[PDB]
Design a protein around this nucleic acid. Structure first.
Lengths: 75, 109, 95, 97, 83, 95, 109, 97, 83
DNA sequence: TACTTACATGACAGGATGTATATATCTGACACGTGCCTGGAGACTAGGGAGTAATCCCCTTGGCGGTTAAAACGCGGGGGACAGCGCGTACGTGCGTTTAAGCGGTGCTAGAGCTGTCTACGACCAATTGAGCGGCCTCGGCACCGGGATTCTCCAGGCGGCCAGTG
DNA sequence: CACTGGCCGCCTGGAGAATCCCGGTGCCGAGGCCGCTCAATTGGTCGTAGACAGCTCTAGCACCGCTTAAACGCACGTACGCGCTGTCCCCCGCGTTTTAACCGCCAAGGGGATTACTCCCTAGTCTCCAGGCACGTGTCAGATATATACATCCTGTCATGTAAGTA
């Protein structure tokens, strides 16, 4: 069980903070370093990405939808 | 007082006609003259080739529980041997169709 | 009547019954085998002509056609063909 | 609800069915008409043996089969399950025309 | 008398069946017309050879033995009608 | 003592000076032209031989090579070689 | 007592030798008979081929402003002609290299 | 600081230079050594004419550069510019070797 | 007299310079050994054919004529070496 | 923050259907019997190509002394390959309609194709020759070298626009 | 919310090395001439191959009628390529270092090639005869038909993970 995976996504994207947004490669390897079944949870991380983009906490840098790269919002 | 007429196919123990292949070489205009062992060697080569591809054809037909060879059996004979396929990659069999050959990537998961 | 139209059908039948007495053959497959015999024969004749002309040979011998088999026939098929032809020519030379 | 199969499954069954098949895949009479049509562009009032139409039929379909095996190789090389005519064009270019 | 379009008689389902023989699982709409075109080119090449043979044979009906010979020239020697 | 090896030297040099009087040759390019004439001669002669085999004619006439030049050479090159050969054989019969 | 010696090539107005090609066809063994128009026809075809290719080589050498042809000129002559590539698709030229053929994507921008 | 060109334009400089070049790119002596080494595997004590080693060198060079244009066609099919061994295998398969 | 590792005799820059003639801008690291392998099998075919030509001639010194003939009968005719 | 809850996504199960699986039948193509004659060989002969010894000489093989070009290696790094993923998207698939191919059915004649002629033509020997190739030189077109111009290719300053920060 | 500074992306101007590009120098391979020789030519004959002429007889041309799958076009679910934004890492490029390839030179002999001799071998031809071709004809393997099992596969209902609300 444990905490929800969206929190893991938030800490993974807040860990790096590049000038540009973080794409899915560095995100999925950040989860792999933190510890996650990234191979069997592509749909789970896809719905997590859709949830975090749609609700407005996180903003997309240059990509469209779940494609592309992602940064933190203004506040 | 002529001797009894034997056949060169029986002389070399072959089933292919040494006479017909020799005539086809002599009248096919491939050299001015032909050494005598060459048609015998040729008939032996074709006899072995036809024999083993009929081996594959008969075994494939017995695998498909039919006793009579259709050209599908010949396609299945030739295309299932790599070395014959190196011999006959560019050759089309009439009504043989295609060897069962499906790429694994386009097969589903 | 008609003029006699030649084919290798009887010899395909003979080797077929030799290696598989129990099986049958169709006419379309018979034509395929006749085309196969014609094709392999003309290939070997062409290579034999080229080897004869390159050595300026006015005859194609068992050496020439053996060479032509080693050129055309790949690998262990060629070695078995050499073995079969060598056995055949030794039996023929034994009269 | 009327029963309906997912895409590609019927396509794969088609692939299996006609690889298993050995028959002629083209309607015979329009092929005969087309080869007569192309023939009339070369010499007037030409006729065809039925066997010549047979042999052109099997050769045409087999040459097309050879192009689609080359197409398949190029298409999987292009990582696509849907082929495009540029793949056939590349296949023609490499084949040595 | 003359015919102006029989290439469409090599129908879209028939081209689909031909590609089903080759293992093609999905076919875009662009391919069929270009395969008709390259079939026109290939049959043009073969039948040009065929009329050239037949005219050299001084015949006015094409024989299948002309077809096999023309295919043998082009490098796609066809079994099943030789002789 | 050396034995003569025959080639197409003075003929290709003649057709060069007729087509370009002020352009020279290298020996390697001259070998390329020798190999070209040999290869095209082999292609035409072999296709003609197969044609004579097909129609059961024992001879290669100008019509056999006319057939072969429509076969192997495509289009403009073929028909203009046909025209050259046609006027050539008419001049040859007129001499 | 004898006719003056007159070659068949000058009779045809061709400068490839008719007797040479006739000789090479007779001992090339393509048939037992050869029509009299056949070698002069073949020599005419070859002369048109060589005249065409030496015209292309001469223009290529003039554009390379070199007086004598090099196999680079012959490679440029063959590859820049469509029907010659149709004729010699499977032919290797010694030290001819390749035609300057850079694909459009390889260029920058 | 010493001058340095961007990755690739030296390669295209080589492209332009070597398509204008005609010279044999394979080193003569190790190519001769490789021909002797391959031939000794089949038949012993084989001697090679220098011109024969040359003709093998243009043979290898032209065959390989033809296959390399072929693989570059395969690469621009595959939206790539760096060719891979699978492009080479594709060319080998669709050519029929 | 015996030679062992002449597969590396065709050096990596030699392969790169071939592909520079081959119109290739970027060459992967896996290319060199596998192209060495395909060159090896190509020369295996060609030299096997040529050696068969030589021993058919009962000769021990390999000649370029047999090389260009081995090339030609594989559909790879070469110009400029007496072919 | 753990505990409880309810829905998306797979887990598990099940029935329709197309293709494989069980015989029944009748058919004609395939297997088999008959006349033959066209073709397979046997023996002698003519004669011709090719196998083999010698040798020689020339072209290849074996060997050495430098030489940097070339091969090899290491680091900086820009760039190529690409994993996935929405997103428009184009095509497979189901299914009634249509029509034109398929089946099956008749006239025939024009054309494929076999047969007698005799001519057109080609193959081939002796003599003769004259064009075409080996040898050699010689020389200027080309192989090699030295110095500006330009072209290419990276670099750097300026402007604007975008992006971020604060009152 | 409006002002404002700062930094990068492109515009714009600069700078220096690689190769044109232009002039200068020797040298080698082109080709022109000489010698040779052998192959092309011609006349004439022998022989024979194929177009011509004529016939004949068979399968395609031509036409005609019934039928149901071909197909075809629309609906609609639904699988698809692909640009893209990075990220990963991997050869490209720019050096330095090292070494053996190239050049130049030298000695050896291997065998490629040529000539000569000789004899092994093979087409030709008449003839005799015999084995597969032509042709005819019976007949069970399968081509078709009818009833049945199972893949299969997609779909209906549960399990679980998980997101969301809450004490």
């Amino acid at each position: 069980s444990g905490p929800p995976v969206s929190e893991l996504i938030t800490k993974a994207v807040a860990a790096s903070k590049e000038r540009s947004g973080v794409s899915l490669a560095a995100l999925k390897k950040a989860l792999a370093a933190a510890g996650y079944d990234v191979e069997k949870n592509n749909s789970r991380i896809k719905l997590g990405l859709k949830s975090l983009v749609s609700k407005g906490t996180l903003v997309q840098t240059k990509g469209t939808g779940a494609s592309g790269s992602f940064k933190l919002n203004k506040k | 007082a002529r001797a009894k007429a034997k056949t060169r196919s029986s002389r070399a123990g072959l089933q292919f006609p040494v006479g017909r292949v020799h005539r086809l070489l002599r009248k096919g205009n491939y050299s001015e003259r032909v050494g005598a062992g060459a048609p015998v060697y040729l008939a032996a080569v074709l006899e072995y080739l036809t024999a083993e591809i009929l081996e594959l054809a008969g075994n494939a037909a017995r695998d498909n529980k039919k006793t009579r060879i259709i050209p599908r059996h010949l396609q299945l004979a030739i295309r299932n041997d790599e070395e014959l396929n190196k011999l006959l990659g560019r050759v089309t069999i009439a009504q043989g169709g295609v060897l069962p050959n499906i790429q694994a990537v386009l097969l589903p998961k | 009547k008609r003029s006699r139209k030649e084919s290798y059908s009887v010899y395909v039948y003979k080797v077929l019954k030799q290696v598989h007495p129990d099986t049958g053959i169709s006419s379309k497959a018979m034509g395929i085998m006749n085309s196969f015999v014609n094709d392999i024969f003309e290939r070997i004749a062409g290579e034999a002509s080229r080897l004869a002309h390159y050595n300026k040979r006015s005859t194609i011998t068992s050496r020439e056609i053996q060479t032509a088999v080693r050129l055309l026939l790949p690998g262990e098929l060629a070695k078995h063909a050499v073995s079969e032809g060598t056995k055949a020519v030794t039996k023929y030379t034994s009269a | 609800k009327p029963h309906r199969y997912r895409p590609g499954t019927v396509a794969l069954r088609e692939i299996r069915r006609y690889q298993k098949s050995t028959e002629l895949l083209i309607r015979k009479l329009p092929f005969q008409r087309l080869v007569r049509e192309i023939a009339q562009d070369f010499k007037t009032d030409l006729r065809f043996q039925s066997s010549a139409v047979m042999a052109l039929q099997e050769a045409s379909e087999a040459y097309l089969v050879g192009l689609f095996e080359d197409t398949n190789l190029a298409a999987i090389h292009a990582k696509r399950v849907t082929i495009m005519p540029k793949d056939i064009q590349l296949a023609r270019r490499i084949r040595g025309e | 008398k003359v015919l102006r379009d029989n290439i469409q008689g090599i129908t879209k389902p028939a081209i689909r069946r031909l590609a089903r023989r080759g293992g093609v699982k999905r076919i875009s709409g662009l391919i069929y017309e270009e395969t008709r075109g390259v079939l026109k080119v290939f049959l043009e090449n073969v039948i040009r050879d065929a009329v050239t043979y037949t005219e050299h044979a001084k015949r006015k009906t094409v024989t299948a033995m002309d077809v096999v010979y023309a295919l043998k020239r082009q490098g796609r020697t066809l079994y099943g009608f030789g002789g």
